[PDB]
Amino acid sequence: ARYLGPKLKLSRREGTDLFLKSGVRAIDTKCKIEQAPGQHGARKPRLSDYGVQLREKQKVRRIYGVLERQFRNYYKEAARLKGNTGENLLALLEGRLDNVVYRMGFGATRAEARQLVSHKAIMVNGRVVNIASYQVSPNDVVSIREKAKKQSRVKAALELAEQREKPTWLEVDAGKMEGTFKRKPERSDLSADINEHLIVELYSK
Amino acid sequence: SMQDPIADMLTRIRNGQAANKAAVTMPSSKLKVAIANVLKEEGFIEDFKVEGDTKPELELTLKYFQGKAVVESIQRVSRPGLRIYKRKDELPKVMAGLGIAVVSTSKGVMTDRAARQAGLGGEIICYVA
């Protein structure tokens, strides 16, 4: 129930940085980011409509580290909830605690943030939550626990967060090591690279 | 034999429009005239007129706009072989409200718009669009 394999070959397949390394150095220096993985990597075959849709869904999944069953449930939810289904889906994925812990800047990667949550180093409005998929709601404080504040992982991550673009929907304090989930991110707040309608098509077919 | 004079009127209009006829003349009846009013008031036909006593003849004057005939379609709905009656909540919107359904309600023949407003259902005579 997690991908434990090599992280860059995921990125190389998608042909795009999925932030599965910390960003201490460029992805270009760590791998051949241009080339897809394996023997027939340099080959770039003509991709079908299904293949385009698939690769888009697999991109978004691989960023947030969601496996297919759980991802499909998010789609079903996003479709159920009112509004545009595609932007609903990305909202649900941003709402995940392991993502929120990454976005604030406590994990270097989302898999590190997932290790933080998993290992009972995170609190949400006081209480310890060790579920990666937990939906962090608006006006919720997320916090490092006092034993976990001494970790070098958290401080080092908080430095990398400054180099990254700041989420407008999160207000964080690096000193106290806690941040508010102010509001649900709009589609504008999230990246324009993700083509959510392709994912909607993929599950709508 | 002749067993649906309404379908016959609709067909005379449909055919007459296709044949770029100025006017179409059928044998008259109260219900035909009632429909002719709704088609006049909604602006599908131009005018009508009954003429005669023993055998009255209805005479619809047909409309054409920019060359084309105004009645795009005109479909019998309720027919002798299968009567269609709808409640007020289930009245049909023809062409998303851009066309009419002619409805015989307890308060006379009228559009489905007028029937919705009057809070009545009834027999769905035809669609026009």
Binding site: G83, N84, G86 | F44, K63, M95, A96, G97, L98, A129
Partner: protein, 156 residues
């Protein structure tokens, strides 16, 4: 400016004394994305030239669709040959719910939200023709008001 889309490439054959002469057909659609759409069908011995021929024909044979805020005015039925298409206006954020041939016509035409179904033959050429036949004979309130000799709010 124009969204060009390739729907179908097909290999076709005439027989001669020598044997079979193969050639390529390309079916394309072009549109502005604001209710102007045209299909083109081009034949050549090579696929590129068939496509280039299809695109050139498509640009010269565009028609005007009277759209309503990125969806249809009303339900429409198109027919061509064995293709019977049905298309219905949808709510915002529906997307195009359509098969691949109809999808391409509707995307380039500028229909964002629509429920479509192709009944009968799903032959790409005839489906495209039935769809565009549908779109071009879709009435707006304004032209309905015009023909009936009323105002738009009398109609609506």
């Amino acid at each position: 400016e124009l969204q060009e889309k390739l729907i179908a490439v097909n290999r076709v054959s005439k027989t001669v004394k020598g044997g079979r002469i193969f050639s390529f057909t390309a079916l394309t659609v072009v549109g502005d994305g604001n209710g102007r759409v045209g299909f083109g069908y081009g034949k050549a011995r090579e696929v590129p030239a068939a496509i280039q021929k299809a695109m050139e024909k498509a640009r010269r044979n565009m028609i005007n669709v009277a759209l309503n805020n990125g969806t249809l005015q009303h339900p429409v039925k198109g027919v061509h040959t064995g293709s019977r298409v049905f298309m219905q206006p949808a709510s915002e954020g529906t997307g195009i719910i359509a098969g691949g041939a109809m999808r391409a016509v509707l995307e380039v035409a500028g229909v964002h939200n629509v429920l479509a179904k192709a009944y009968g033959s799903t032959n790409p050429i005839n489906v495209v023709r039935a769809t565009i036949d549908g779109l071009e004979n879709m009435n707006s309130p304004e032209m309905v008001a015009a023909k009936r000799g009323k105002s738009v709010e009398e109609i609506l």
